Every structure is written in C-alpha cells, then in structure tokens.
Design a protein around this ligand. Structure first.
Ligand SMILES: *[C@@H]1O[C@H](CO)[C@@H](O[C@@H]2O[C@H](CO)[C@@H](O[C@@H]3O[C@H](CO[C@H]4O[C@H](CO[C@H]5O[C@H](CO)[C@@H](O)[C@H](O)[C@@H]5O)[C@@H](O)[C@H](O[C@@H]5O[C@H](CO)[C@@H](O)[C@H](O)[C@@H]5O)[C@@H]4O)[C@@H](O)[C@H](O[C@H]4O[C@H](CO)[C@@H](O)[C@H](O)[C@@H]4O[C@H]4O[C@H](CO)[C@@H](O)[C@H](O)[C@@H]4O[C@H]4O[C@H](CO)[C@@H](O)[C@H](O)[C@@H]4O)[C@@H]3O)[C@H](O)[C@H]2NC(C)=O)[C@H](O)[C@H]1NC(C)=O
Ligand SMILES: *[C@@H]1O[C@H](CO)[C@@H](O[C@@H]2O[C@H](CO)[C@@H](O[C@@H]3O[C@H](CO[C@H]4O[C@H](CO)[C@@H](O)[C@H](O)[C@@H]4O)[C@@H](O)[C@H](O[C@H]4O[C@H](CO)[C@@H](O)[C@H](O)[C@@H]4O[C@H]4O[C@H](CO)[C@@H](O)[C@H](O)[C@@H]4O)[C@@H]3O)[C@H](O)[C@H]2NC(C)=O)[C@H](O)[C@H]1NC(C)=O
Ligand SMILES: *[C@@H]1O[C@H](CO)[C@@H](O[C@@H]2O[C@H](CO)[C@@H](O)[C@H](O)[C@H]2NC(C)=O)[C@H](O)[C@H]1NC(C)=O
Ligand SMILES: *[C@@H]1O[C@H](CO)[C@@H](O[C@@H]2O[C@H](CO)[C@@H](O)[C@H](O)[C@H]2NC(C)=O)[C@H](O)[C@H]1NC(C)=O
Ligand SMILES: *[C@@H]1O[C@H](CO)[C@@H](O)[C@H](O)[C@H]1NC(C)=O
Ligand SMILES: *[C@@H]1O[C@H](CO)[C@@H](O)[C@H](O)[C@H]1NC(C)=O
Ligand SMILES: *[C@@H]1O[C@H](CO)[C@@H](O)[C@H](O)[C@H]1NC(C)=O
Ligand SMILES: *[C@@H]1O[C@H](CO)[C@@H](O)[C@H](O)[C@H]1NC(C)=O
Ligand SMILES: *[C@@H]1O[C@H](CO)[C@@H](O)[C@H](O)[C@H]1NC(C)=O
Ligand SMILES: *[C@@H]1O[C@H](CO)[C@@H](O)[C@H](O)[C@H]1NC(C)=O
Lengths: 439, 128, 138, 427, 145, 444
C-alpha cells in the first residue's frame, strides 16, 4: 500500500539549451565586453559530483553556437555607428613605392592619389595615401578601385576601439547549471567521470585565427586528438597540445597615420609615409620546439593511423587568404602568414613571411567589410600556439601513407577547442516516489 | 555538500539537500547593447520556469512544502520495485530515468485528487 | 474535455476541471519560450537590438505580471494555495437576486460573468476589507 | 445567508487585442523568413466547444489590422538598405522600339539613352515615364523616394500562420455558409490560424480558401452603396498569365558603390502580355454569383455586370505581381453582361506605388527569361452602383479587404481565470 | 500611522503595524496594473523609445524578483502567510547579548538591524535547516498512523 | 533560553540606487498632445498625494551625490535625442554661402547682426542647381578667407532640423518610487543641502519639477521658505559652484520684437527645411527687462547671507562673467521656441559694504555641452514674448591674493546637473527591507 510522495528540491537534471550571459574580472571601448557588467566571483565555486558519470558531446554543443552568435552580433554592433567609406570608391591613381624598399615588398606597397570631397559638398581636395596590393584592384592601367567597390559596403572601424581579446566567462541563469569534465585525456565525445558543477565557465579569450590556434588552454599530460569521426575525411581534426609553442610576430616598419576630414565632421584614417626603410612582415617559430611538437602529434595520430605507416605534413590547397594562410590580429593589425615552412615533413628559429591587409570581409560573409585603420609605429606581439587545426587527404590509394594539411577555417572550431569541457543542463526540482504515508 | 552535491547520493540521503537545491532557483545606466539584452532575457526565463513549478505545487496541494504526501496510491505499473531498492542503492537521476514516461500520468492524478479534496472541504464548510 | 472544453457547460459542471485552466497559462509560457530557444537559430532577430526584440520581451514580462497580479490578489484575500475559497463577505441581492439553483444550473460561466460584470470592483474591495478585519481579530 | 466564493480556473474570456506571433514551416532569402521563424506546431489541434455561442464581426477584427501593419513593415524593412534611384532622374533621350514588334506593342517600350557622372542606355515601359516639352523623365522623378528592390529578395508568398501568445486563444467559427458577422454556433478553440498566403491583388482575389457548397456574399452593409462586397466562390477558376517576351538584364554604375539593374534588349519578337480565363467556367461562375446576389435585391431583379470606373490604374485593372513583375490586366471582358478561353491583355510596369502611399515607390528589376504563371481565382471584390436593374463593378485598393477574406472566421480573446459566485458556504 | 510611520518607534511598539507595511509591499503588482488602466495604451508611446523603455522594463522585472525572493524565504522557513512567526532555532548570545527588554524597548528597528547585520546569513541558514527537519518529522507521524 | 523570531513588514530601509519612474498630472497630456514631456512620462500621479511624517527619525542627506539628479539628467538627454532622430537632416545645406549685409530699416545696434545668404541647391534632376536664399544671424555664420561663408558646424557635425510638431515646453514632471522603494524628503527650513535633517517625511512622488533649461540664472523653480539660502558642496573652495536659492522671485520680461516670416524649402522627397524669411517692419534688439529696485534688494539679501561664511568686515563684489563660449558667458534660455543669449553684466555689477539686458538669437544650437551633434531651430513666425520668474542665482567665487579682504562673485556655472540639483536636493531614495529577525520568548 505505498502511496505517492512529492518532493521539491530534488537534485536532478536534463540536457538543455539556455540563455547565457557575460561575466568578467571587473579589472579589465574594447568590443568584447563594453557592457559585460557582471563581475565573476574572484574565487569561482565548483562542486565535485562524486559517483556521477555524464555524457558530453562537443560537436553538438549549443554553447558553441551561442558563442558564435554573440561574437558576430557584438562585432556588428561595434561597427554599426562608424563612418562609411563609400566616398573612397572612386578611381584611384597608383604607382609602386620604390623608396628604400626591399625586394619582398616590391609591388606590394603602393602610393595612390585621388579626388575626394571636403567638409562642404561644393569643394574637393586632392589627397593621397599608401595601400597594400591585396586591397587594390586594377582597372582594365595605373587606375585602380577599392577591392570591394562592386561587392560590399565598407565601414571604417572607429578609432579608440580595441579588438584585444578579453576573457569572457559564460554564466548560466538560475534554474540552470553548467557541468564540466575534469576527466583527463578526454576527447569530448563520450561519457566522462570526475564531473563537477559550476555557475560560470573559465574565461575564454575570443581569439580569432585560422590554421593554428592562439592563446588557448593546454592539455594536461598528453596531446589530445579530437574529431567527430576520424574516418570521415570531411571532418576537421582539432589537436590540443600539452605544451605551448612560442611564436614572435612583427610588422617591422615604423608607420604614420594621416587623418582626412570629409563631410560634416567625418574622418578617414589613412596610411602615411613610412619612416626608415621598408621591410617585410614576418613570424618566428622556435625550430626545435616545432619539430618536437610535430613528433608528439604524430605519435598520438599513430594510435588510429598505424605504427609502420607514414604520416606526412604538407601545405594547404589554394583559396582565399583566410583559408590558405594563418590569419591573426595583433594590436588591431591583420596578418596573413605563410605556414608552408611549418607543415613540411615526413614521419616514420623558422621564419615565416607575412602579408598585411586592411579591407576585410570577416566571418566568411559578403556584403559587409571592415576597413582597418593603420597603427602608427612598429608592431610586435608574442603568442602561445596551444593547438592546431588539421585535415586529411584521401588515403584510398597506398593506404600505408597519409597526409595531413592545415585546414578548416570554420570559426566554430576555435570555440569548440575551449568549450568541449562544458555542458548545459536544466534543473528539474520536482519529482515523485512511493512511500509509506497518507493525508 | 552544496548545489547538486547530492547527485551521487541515494534517494533517501539526498532528501537532506532539498533546501539547498531549492535555494538556487532564484539567484544603473542600461542601454540596448547585446550583453544587456541577454541578461534581461535570462532573468525573465528563470522566473517563468520558477513560477511554472510553484503553481504546479499549488494545484496539487503541498504549497510551501519541500516534502509532502498525497492520497494517490502508487501503481505497480509505473514501477513494481521495493522500498529497499528505491530509497537505497539508487540515486534520483536513475529514478527519474526509470519512471520518466509516467510523469504526466502522475501529475494528472495529483491534480484530480486535490480537486476532489477542495470540493469536499467546501461541502463541510457548507454544513452550517 | 480540453482547456475550454467546459466553456459551454453549466457553472456547476464547470466547477470541476479548474485545474486545467489554472495550469494552462504558465505551461504555455514555458513551452513557447522553450520552442523558440531551441528553434533553428533566429534569435539574431532578437539581438538586432530593435523594437521587435523589445516587444517580444515586453510581452513576456507583462504575461508574468498578469499572472502574479492574480496570485497576489488571492494572497490579499487570504485564498492563496486554493482554487476554491470561501470568504466572509455575504452576497448582496443587489449584485444578483437570482437563486443558487437558478444560476448554478442552466447557465454558463461566460453568461454569469456578463451578468455581474459591474460589481467586480466592489466585491474585490469588500473581500480585502474582510481579510483585514480578520488579521486585526487574530 | 449566501456568501461570496472565489474561483480560480474559471473557463471564461473577453474580447481582447494583442499582438499575435507568426509561425512558418521548415521550408521558409524570403522577406517573411526573418519575421516568421517559429516552427508551426507539427500536429495542430482544436477543441470543439460544445454549447458555446460566440459573436463575430469581421469588419472590426484586429487580426486584419495586424496583418496589414506587419506586411507593410516587412516590405519597408527589406527595401530600406537598397540602392536609391535618385541619380537616374536625369532627362532621357528615347526612341520608339519598333524593331520586330506587333502593332499592339507599338510605342509601348522605349529605348532611352542618358548621361551619368558616361553614355548609357536601357529599356523602359511607357507607363513608367513622362514625355516632356524625344525627352522623357521618370514618372515620379522629382517627387518620390523611388528605390530599387534588392534582386536577392524573394517576395513569393509563403503561407504563414498567426498563433496566440500564452494567455490568449483564437476562436474559430465553423458555421457553414457563415455571414461573417453576428452569432456563431459551431465554435472551436485553436492554437493558430490556417496557413494564409499574403497574396496581394485588386478586383479578383487569388489563391484563397474556397467556400463549401455555396457562393457566399458578405459585406459590412449590403444596401450601403459605399461598401465593398466580398464574394467567396466554392470553385476556383483557373487563370494562366504570361509575359512571353524573352528579356535580359544589365547593370550600370550610377554612383560610387551604386548599381542599377536595367532592362536590356528583348530576344525574339515583342508581343503583348496577357491572361487566359476559361470562358464557360467564367460564365457559370457569374451566374452563381447572380443567383446569390438576388437574395438581397429581389427574385426577378435584373443584375448587370459593368467593366470599371475612373481612378488610378491599380484599382481600375486587375493587379498582381506574379514572378516578381507587376501586371495590370484589363478585366472588362469578364464583366460585360446582364442576367435574368477569354484573353485579357495586360500591361507591365516597374515603378510601383505599393500600398497606395504617396511619395514612395519600389522599382522592380526586370526578370530575365520568360514568365509563365498559373493561379486560382477564389473570390471577387464588387461594388454596387429605378429598382428594376442593379449594376455591379469590380473594386479594390483597400488591402484590408483582402486580408479579411481569410481572417473572417477568427477572433482573439483573453483568458480570465478569476471570478466569483454565491454559495451556501461560510469559512 | 501610514507607511513607515513606525520607523521612529522602538521595536516592540513598531511591530504593532507590520500589517501596514506588508500591505503596501504585497499589493505592488496589483497597483501597477491599476495604474495601466488609468492611462490605457499610453505605453505605446513608451515602447517606441527603447532606452527609456529598457530601463523601465528592468525596473519591472526587478520588482517581481524582490517579491518572489521574500515569499520564497518565508516559504522555505515555514512562515508562509504570516507576518509574525516563531521558529525552533535557539538564539545565540554571540549574535546579540542584551536582555529581552533591552532589545524590545529603547531601540528602533533601524538600530537593531545594524547591530546584527553580520549574523543575518547564519541565522537564515539555521531557519532553513530547522524547517527541513520538521517536515521530515511530519512524514514520520503520518507513516506511524 | 530565547528563540529566533522572524518578522515581515519591518519599517527598515537602506540607501539605494535605483531607477525611478516618470509620472505626470495626466491633464497636461490631454491638453498638449505634441509635448514630449507628456507623450513620454504618461503615467498619472495620484491627484491627492500624502506625506507621512516620521516622528523621531533623523537622516542624512547629500545633494551633491544624489543619484536622482543623475537620473534626471540622463533621462532628459535620452528623450531629447530620440525626438530628433526621425527629423529631416540638413546635410545638403553644408554648402558655400554667398552673403551680404541686411541693411533695410536697421537700428544702430544691429548693423551687421543679420546676414542675407544664398546658395546653389540641387533637388530636381540632380541638375539645374537653383539659387535660393535665407536670412541668418551672425552667430551661426563663419567667414572663410570677402562674401564667402559657411555654417559653423560643417567642420564638426551634421545638423538635424528640429521637427515643427515637437514641443519641448517644460511641464511639471514628478519622479515616483517603484514598489519596494520610498522617497524620503527633508522638510527642514533653511536646509544646508547636506548632513542630518530633523523633519523627514516619506512620499511616493516628488513635487513636480519643470525641466527648464538655463545657464547662469535659474528660472521657474521653487523659492526658499522664509530665508535666502546659500549652499554648496565645499564653501571654502573656488572650484565649486554656489547655488543661491531666493525666497522671493524676480520677474523678468523678454522679447524678440521683430516680426518674422518663413520660407519653406524643399530639399528632397518629403524633406523640408524651414528657413528664416523676410522680416516685416523695422529691426530692433531682442532684450530682457529686470526691475532695478527688486534686483538691488535681491542682491542685498544674498550678500547679507553670503557674509555668514566670509565675515562682516569684508568687501563683497559682484562682477560679470569670464570669457568662454556663449553657453557659459551669457545667460541662455529658450523663450517661445527661440534660443536667447543675454548679457548679464548689467546685473552682476556692484560693491557691497528698469534694467535692460540686450539679447542675441542663435539658430544652430550645440546642446548639453556635447560636441558632434547639432540641432537647427526652425524660425518662428510673428513676435515672441516670455514672462518668467528668476528663482535662484548661480555664482562662482573667483580666486585671489592671500588676504585681498575682498571676495568676488561671478555668474558662472553651465553644467545642467546643477539646475536639477536645485530642485532635487530635498529628496533621497531608499529601499525597503521588510524581512528581518530578533530574539524572543516563544517556540512552535
Ligand atoms: C516660466 O514660466 C512661464 C509661464 O508663465 C513661461 O512663459 C510661457 O511660455 C509658454 C511657451 O511659449 C507660453 O505658452 C504659449 O502661449 C501662447 C499664448 O497664450 C495665450 O493664449 C491664452 C488663451 O487664448 C485662447 O483663449 C482666449 C480666451 O481667453 C481667446 O481669446 C484666444 O483667442 C484663444 O482661443 C491667453 O489666455 C493668454 O493670455 C496671456 O496672459 C498672460 C498673463 O500673464 C500674458 O503674459 C500673455 O502675454 C497673454 O496675454 C495668451 O494670449 C500660445 O500662442 C503658444 O502656443 C503657440 O505655439 C504652439 C506650439 O506648439 C502652437 O501649437 C500654438 O498654436 C501657438 O502658435 C500660434 O502662433 C504661431 C506663430 O507664432 C502660429 O503659427 C500658430 O498657428 C499659432 O497661432 C496663434 O496665433 C494666431 C494669430 O493671432 C491665432 O489666430 C491663433 O489662434 C493662435 O493664437 C503657447 O501655448 C506661455 O503663455 C508663457 N507664459 C507667460 C505668461 O509668459 C516661461 O517660458 C518659463 N520660463 C522659461 C523661459 O523657460
Ligand atoms: C596572446 O597574448 C599576448 C600577451 O597578452 C598578446 O600580446 C599583447 O598584445 C597587446 C595588444 O596588441 C599589447 O598591448 C600594447 O602594449 C603597448 C606597450 O607599450 C610599451 O611602451 C609604453 C610606453 O609608454 C609602456 O607604458 C608599456 O608598458 C610598454 O613598455 C601599449 O603601448 C599599447 O597601448 C595602445 O593600444 C591599446 C589597445 O588596447 C590602447 O588601449 C592604448 O591606449 C594604446 O593606444 C593609443 O595610444 C598609443 C600611444 O603609443 C597610440 O599609438 C595609439 O594609436 C592609440 O592612440 C598596448 O597596450 C601587449 O604589449 C602584448 N604583450 C606582449 C608580451 O607582447 C597577443 O596579442 C595575444 N595573441 C592573440 C592572437 O590575441
Ligand atoms: C559514493 O559511494 C560511496 C560508497 O562507495 C559512499 O561512501 C560511504 O558513505 C557512508 C556514509 O554513511 C560511509 O559509512 C561508508 O563507509 C562510505 N563507503 C566507503 C567505501 O568509503 C559515498 O557517500 C557516495 N557519494 C555520495 C555523494 O553519496
Ligand atoms: C449541451 O446540452 C446537452 C443537452 O441538450 C447536454 O447533454 C446532456 O448531458 C447530461 C449530463 O450533464 C446527460 O445526462 C443527458 O442525457 C445529455 N442529453 C442528451 C440529449 O444527450 C450536453 O452535455 C451539453 N454540453 C455541455 C458542454 O455541457
Ligand atoms: C581630379 O580631376 C581632374 C579633372 O580634370 C583630373 O584631371 C585629375 O587627374 C583628378 N585627380 C585625381 C588624383 O584623381
Ligand atoms: C574518442 O573519439 C571517438 C570518435 O568520436 C569515440 O568513439 C571514442 O569513444 C572517444 N574516446 C573516449 C575516451 O570517449
Ligand atoms: C448578414 O449581413 C447583413 C449586412 O447588411 C445583415 O443585414 C444581416 O442581418 C446579416 N445576417 C445574419 C444572419 O447575421
Ligand atoms: C446601411 O446602408 C444604408 C444605405 O443603403 C443605410 O440606409 C443604412 O442605415 C445602413 N445601415 C446602418 C448600419 O445604419
Ligand atoms: C521641525 O518641525 C517642528 C514641528 O513642526 C518645528 O517646530 C521645527 O521648527 C522644524 N525644524 C526645522 C529646522 O524646520
Ligand atoms: C554646511 O555646508 C558646508 C558646505 O561646505 C559644510 O562645510 C558645513 O559643515 C555644513 N554644516 C552643517 C551643520 O551641516
């Protein structure tokens, strides 16, 4: 004669989507967190769930999709109120820069002049600036248009806006919780033990890059190879290193900036002359570290690919620079570095040249582009690689040897690499059970 | 323990954390910016789900309690398991899975039982 | 019968099933927000920071306030926790001079509400006064 | 000794006005796609309400006004960021396009050359230009905000559903042969409306619901000659429409970052656009309407159908926008008889004063290739003009009347769970 | 003496009007809805001004949250529906070491609140635990019959 | 063996920063549908508010840190900007102007005050540029180096024309606490603005305040009760402005006597500009009248009170403003929809131990001391007269030698927050915390 008993506050949960919000360290005009508002606890709480086993799947993680949306929306919010550059989509007259310029930059840096209006609609001014070849398109000889004149609206990024990544902590609203795997050597697709509950995630820096990751977390103890399905060549492989690789990047030229008033108080920023000589942009990767790093990676790949098999690294297929090169942003400047000097080995201080571009159609979309204003002086940045994004070739012929190349580029992968340890669940406090009682 | 620390505990032992678990359900310039909107939506969502559960308890009777008892008998159909098998050597998560597809049946029965009780207290008050 | 299934039944018959109508509002709010939240991702519309997004949020808040208004009022009258409560305010022949068999049978709640619509505020005020007197007595 | 009892969960409601939300199917680049993103219920349900008499008034129904407001807003949102055509207001030098044409199209198209900030030319329809002082200008050159629709946007109607927000319900009238107003006895509660295609037309209503086993004639006031009469048919009449000329499209640079889409030379011969209505079907259709009209005019009253009246083109000819181009068809061949394969020539124009507003217009870029459309005539909009003979003419232009064609059986009510009643019971 | 007229009274005397403040706070949602009937649909003007509107909306949401938090605490502590309740939690001399008459007269509620501000969370945790134990004991009695 | 008791409805509060809601008398809305202050802030106040005296309750106030002031400031800016967002922009008028002098029936005082400017506008065909003309006040036109001019904001911002249908006329506005909050007010006579207040009362809403915008002299505020009150954040510094609240108002009569007309110029498709048209009759100066004796008496009272912080054997001198732009050097009020900048050197000129103030009119207004936004005030037809109450002075103390023995005060200020402070200084927002505990002698 057991009867129904009802409880409230029962410690159970179900997989769920929720609305997430930002929290920060308080201490940190920077686009990623102008109104994050919520401070995190200086000492985040975490509860160990002993005797709990839970299922995680990083490839179906709704948190990744939400981060993607929040990043895009904030990006657009930043540019929405900034000056349009439509008046610059005019015939431009260009010659090469030959003044104490090295061979690597011949034909890359251009000196261009044009007719643009002043503050009054009745008057024009003759102005000039320097441009990089990548953003200048030839008409039919010395005449050029902006690369995206017939393609997209160009919005100038506002000055005094920082793009520097700020760790963002995602927090769940009351009624929801975030579960995390502390289980070591976890590849993100199966059950994990050592599960804990938190209210907020660790801070994640919204770093944007392509072929190689930058400033992420390191794996503990071993290199972890993660993919949805290893067998399917269409899937990308996210490799998380347990040691960083140091990379030193620079824009060696001492630049200047001009500011041209146009229209009713609007301003256009443009590259001025270069002080000193003109040199090519580049990145240094410690050589010994890089070699050792690949050996560590290969050793883990062999678990799925064979002991007597040959693992090769090679450069990527052609396509847009955000596919074929290593893209990153330092101080707000946009670099496109050649990685063929890294992925060139067979298993059984490296200098990489870089290009600079200013008109950029970020997030793989057409119709909008940002114009990145120049930064005066000399740019230097040092980063931690902490992981690679690789893809594999066919392997159907002579399946003793397989080649991996830098690849992917889908921006989602840069988040999956940090969010794979987290899951959102909802708390469901009500439940029933039989017992001995009556009213 | 703390919030959900009882997840690995047996159903019986876990009853000692009902209060803490309940306590976590409801935890100057402001412009339209993305982070601002998401926080406000998040606050609203938490409230909407909270109220749904409180009303459901009100309908069934037991308002204000963490632990209560009703007059609906337990059906062996839902689960013909012993108390020594349910209240021990089992967690609430496991239990929820075991009887997951009977949830709405139970709820309908609880609602009807309270409805009948309300009619009966109205009749007694109507006595004189 | 269904959510408004008892609408054409007499007031007496419709005194039963009150649980479904009471349950329907919050169930509906949660289900609609859940359906949208996991919907093929269109919330970018909400995040355009436009008037549409604000109106959607305003609607949610007002629905909650209306719900609470009723619960708060039941609390004021001392009826919290019950779907049916008796009070100590006597019925006025002015509001209606029809007898109990006359109204509970052969009439729906929709018809009843129209008949006494003009006394709603009066009755509510009286119910509050009655509860205040009891708080003073105890 | 009766006492007040308070009851919560009472099944009552009141007329109310709120904002309904839009739901769509899985298949929904379309103008409505952003707005209607919520999936519809995979298996919609209704609750029949036994012994409930409700009251409807389709002429005062705030579902109609909402649909109207929402559609206008979306069209404007879509066009808001597109290229403005102000730079093209400069005077044009035009020829008569008589190369390989039929006589019915003579002078209908014009080959216009003009200067820009460069010598350029394009073809225009006669109805979009005004001859001044070979010199032509755009018809609203210096008066309106003529903008170009972005070619990527689809305006193809997709059925949409309006759904009640929680706390609200939609009541649906199922009475057969319902008048559109007054008491209704077959009422069910629904979650959402049926899908409705947001089709825009004048004179003849296209792709709506059909009446069941009768032609139903509804109006706000049947004798008031100032009111329109909506006629809902129980059978569709098929109409085939076309723009047989094989077109091409070119782009030109009108300003920095600004391109205009121009009509290029026509491939093949030039002939007139038209619509085909089966003759026998149409004559039976008119007869059915007359049989029903007599109910309000007399058993032996003579009824005449007249072609048209004066006014702006959009309301004197039949109008529709199939394929994305705008057709203005002469319906006089459909309303020329007295009771007691019909080819309609069509004109095409690109600058549209959509929604009957002044000072705003949309320019429709041309469609390359050939347009062939098939559609269902489901109803008519008529206006009534010695008691022996009554005369009726096609009407339209107030879009509320079209939306009302489908939204006449639904009303929105608010649910109100609290109320009181007396009983023999004290605390 | 109207809302907060008891603020200058000592704790004992002030408690005589807990009803007055409770009625003003516990009717807050009901009153806001009444105000929306006094000026029906003027809110449509407000809905077009989004920054003004987001601030006012935030205020409405917070008012609801405050309401619910107070009710939740009274619920979990077993004081639902009451303005005055006693519970089975002994008082610690650590929190305050003055005599009963010393506390209840010759001191206002504002002064008192300052004196024990640092013990509020401790006390609340104890109130919570006691009620949970009481609910189990009721379940025992029902089972015993 | 005492036990814990729990109470709800306890009369306890804490200082708090929250959002207040805006409310009005309602009747004003129905009367003036185009007033921004009625359209927004539409919620009615009770017609019969109460004040609850708190017996034996002492509270401290600090007007200089009052969050209610900051909210009022922000709400005003927000409403103002939204009102202008949908209005016709005047970007097409940032053109080269060709200007000559208006010499027709001009009195000596205005010889060169008004200019007749013309320019080439292109709205039709983007061709056939049409020469058009309008009149401008000297203050809005800058010479480019003989007859070549531009509008002053072409190197800063676009100018948005204010909508003719939008009225900004100040009406009383009340701030009201949301449920859960209360506003305490200080009733003490001769209140300093800071520190303890003996007579404290609880209210739901503040008195109505008209959001009147002015610089160097407050208009249409509350008068002091039975005393002239001089208050400041730091009376011994010179870095702070001094707010002087008068106990009697001084009436001021202002006019713009010239009879104006308008020219409607079409810029685009529903885009219209309202230009100053021809002026009917003779041209004479705009000005404000102040009664001389009243003004003297007013200063004498101020000085008598001012001496409390300076001593009796000291010289108090009033002097005119320091240099800077018009927003701070002249008195600045909007009269009948026109912006006036008046010379107050005729008022603050005396040494203690029928006054006519000439005025200028400007149309391009850069408001709230912001840079990068601008408004164009369309001209108003006819003649404009305003009769207002001066209710408080804004003074600044100058610097000086170690012992000059003389203090000098000037008509300084200009930060709008201070005008709001002069009305909101009596109010404080607190939150109510009704739930709490105490020891007792009972058990369940
Ligand atoms: C500090 O506080 C003070 C307040 O004391 C502030 O000063 C105030 O400022 C406001 C704002 O400008 C100002 O309000 C204006 O008042 C104008 C006139 O008000 C008068 O009208 C009433 C009633 O008239 C009606 O009723 C009588 C019956 O009794 C009829 O006979 C009459 O025909 C009509 O139907 C009079 O009672 C009143 O009498 C006054 O008494 C005062 C005593 O102290 C005295 O001082 C006054 O001089 C006066 O004698 C007035 O005559 C009013 O016109 C303003 O409204 C105009 O602008 C709004 C903008 O939205 C328009 O909507 C409105 O139509 C008005 O516009 C007209 O004019 C323009 C061109 O100028 C035209 O294009 C319009 O079409 C309108 O047409 C008018 O003129 C036509 C031509 O004659 C006529 O045919 C039309 O019928 C129209 O009249 C506005 O409401 C306060 O009056 C003013 N108060 C005082 C006192 O100064 C001060 O600013 C504050 N501090 C600061 C500086 O911030
Ligand atoms: C992986 O993680 C690494 C480590 O964090 C990260 O590298 C760091 O990148 C940031 C951003 O590029 C670097 O930050 C800059 O540092 C210089 C340092 O200046 C030196 O000299 C000054 C002399 O006065 C000293 O005070 C200072 O301590 C240093 O010795 C700063 O000058 C930069 O400031 C400007 O940019 C800021 C952008 O946020 C502005 O907020 C700031 O106001 C400055 O801009 C304005 O003033 C300038 C005046 O010179 C003017 O020129 C500008 O136009 C403008 O008006 C800035 O703080 C940081 O040093 C790097 N750390 C290391 C070790 O190299 C990698 O970028 C990251 N990788 C990825 C992919 O994200
Ligand atoms: C997880 O399971 C272990 C048993 O393997 C539980 O540990 C026991 O706890 C009781 C408490 O009364 C002790 O008397 C036993 O000696 C413990 N067993 C062992 C082997 O140490 C543990 O409590 C469970 N976790 C949770 C959250 O309930
Ligand atoms: C609508 O009215 C009919 C009567 O015309 C109701 O049908 C009766 O219901 C009672 C139970 O309440 C049965 O005992 C009778 O035998 C039924 N009559 C017939 C002829 O079948 C019907 O229930 C009413 N609808 C609603 C919703 O109350
Ligand atoms: C500016 O316009 C003139 C027009 O005569 C042209 O000759 C000149 O090359 C143009 N200059 C630039 C930099 O485009
Ligand atoms: C590693 O990934 C594969 C493929 O997704 C999966 O089958 C395997 O279970 C994962 N390893 C662990 C420990 O979960
Ligand atoms: C149908 O509508 C007409 C409109 O003039 C009205 O006169 C008639 O009474 C209505 N019929 C019914 C059954 O409601
Ligand atoms: C309907 O229209 C007729 C005109 O034919 C008019 O006489 C009659 O009064 C109208 N009905 C109403 C609603 O008054
Ligand atoms: C405070 O109020 C009392 C009683 O009305 C009055 O006598 C006293 O003068 C007031 N004090 C001040 C500073 O206004
Ligand atoms: C009055 O205000 C001045 C302002 O600087 C301050 O120094 C003084 O201490 C205050 N006096 C009292 C009694 O609060």
């Amino acid at each position: 004669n057991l009867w129904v008993t009802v409880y409230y506050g029962v410690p159970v949960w179900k997989d769920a989507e929720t609305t997430l919000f930002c929290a920060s360290d308080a201490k940190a005009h920077n686009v990623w967190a102008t109104h994050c508002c919520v401070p995190t606890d200086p000492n985040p709480q975490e509860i160990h769930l002993e005797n709990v086993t839970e299922e995680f799947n990083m490839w179906k993680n709704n948190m990744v999709e939400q981060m993607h949306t929040d990043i895009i929306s904030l990006w657009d919010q930043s540019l929405k109120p900034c000056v349009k550059l439509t008046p610059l989509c005019v015939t431009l007259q260009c010659t090469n820069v030959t003044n104490n310029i090295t061979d690597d930059m011949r034909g890359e840096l251009k000196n261009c002049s044009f007719n643009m209006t002043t503050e009054l609609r009745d008057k024009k001014q003759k102005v000039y600036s320097l441009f990089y070849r990548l953003d200048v398109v030839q008409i039919n000889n010395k005449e050029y248009r902006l690369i995206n004149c017939n393609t997209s609206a160009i919005t100038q990024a506002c000055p005094k806006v920082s793009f520097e990544p700020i760790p963002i902590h995602y927090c769940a609203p009351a009624g929801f919780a975030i579960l995390k795997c502390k289980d070591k050597k976890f590849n993100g697709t199966g059950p994990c033990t050592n599960v804990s509950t938190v209210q907020c995630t660790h801070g994640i820096k919204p770093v944007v890059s392509t072929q190689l990751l930058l400033n992420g977390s390191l794996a503990e103890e071993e290199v972890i190879i993660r993919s949805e399905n290893i067998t399917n060549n269409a899937k990308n492989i996210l490799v998380q290193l347990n040691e960083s690789v140091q990379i030193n990047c620079t824009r060696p030229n001492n630049n200047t900036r001009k500011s041209i008033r146009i229209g009713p108080g609007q301003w256009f920023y443009a590259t001025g002359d270069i002080i000193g000589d003109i040199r090519q942009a580049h990145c240094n990767v410690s050589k010994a570290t890089w070699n050792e790093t690949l050996g560590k990676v290969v050793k883990q790949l062999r678990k799925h690919f064979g002991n007597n098999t040959i693992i090769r690294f090679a450069n990527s297929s052609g396509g847009d620079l955000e596919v074929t090169t290593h893209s990153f942003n330092c101080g707000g400047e946009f670099f496109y570095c050649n990685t063929s000097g890294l992925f060139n080995s067979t298993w059984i201080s490296i200098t990489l040249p870089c290009r600079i571009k200013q008109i950029i159609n970020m997030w793989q979309r057409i119709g909008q582009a940002m114009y990145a204003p120049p930064i005066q002086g000399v740019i230097r940045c040092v980063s931690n690689i902490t992981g690679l994004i690789l893809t594999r070739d066919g392997g159907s012929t002579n399946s003793t040897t397989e080649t991996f190349r830098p690849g992917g580029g889908d921006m989602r992968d840069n988040w999956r690499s940090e969010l794979y340890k987290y899951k959102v669940v909802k708390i469901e406090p009500l439940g029933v059970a039989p017992t001995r009682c009556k009213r | 323990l703390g919030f959900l620390g009882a997840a690995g505990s047996t159903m019986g032992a876990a009853s000692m954390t009902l209060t803490v678990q309940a306590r976590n359900l409801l935890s100057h310039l402001l412009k339209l910016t993305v982070w601002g909107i998401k926080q406000l939506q998040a606050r609203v969502l938490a409230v909407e789900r909270y109220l749904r559960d409180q009303q459901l308890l009100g309908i069934w009777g037991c308002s204000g309690k963490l632990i209560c008892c009703t007059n609906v008998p337990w059906n062996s159909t839902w689960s013909n398991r012993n108390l020594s098998e349910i209240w021990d050597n089992m967690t609430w998560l496991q239990w929820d899975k075991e009887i997951s597809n009977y949830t709405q049946i139970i709820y309908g029965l609880l609602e009807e039982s309270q409805n009948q009780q309300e009619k009966n207290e109205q009749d007694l008050l109507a006595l004189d």
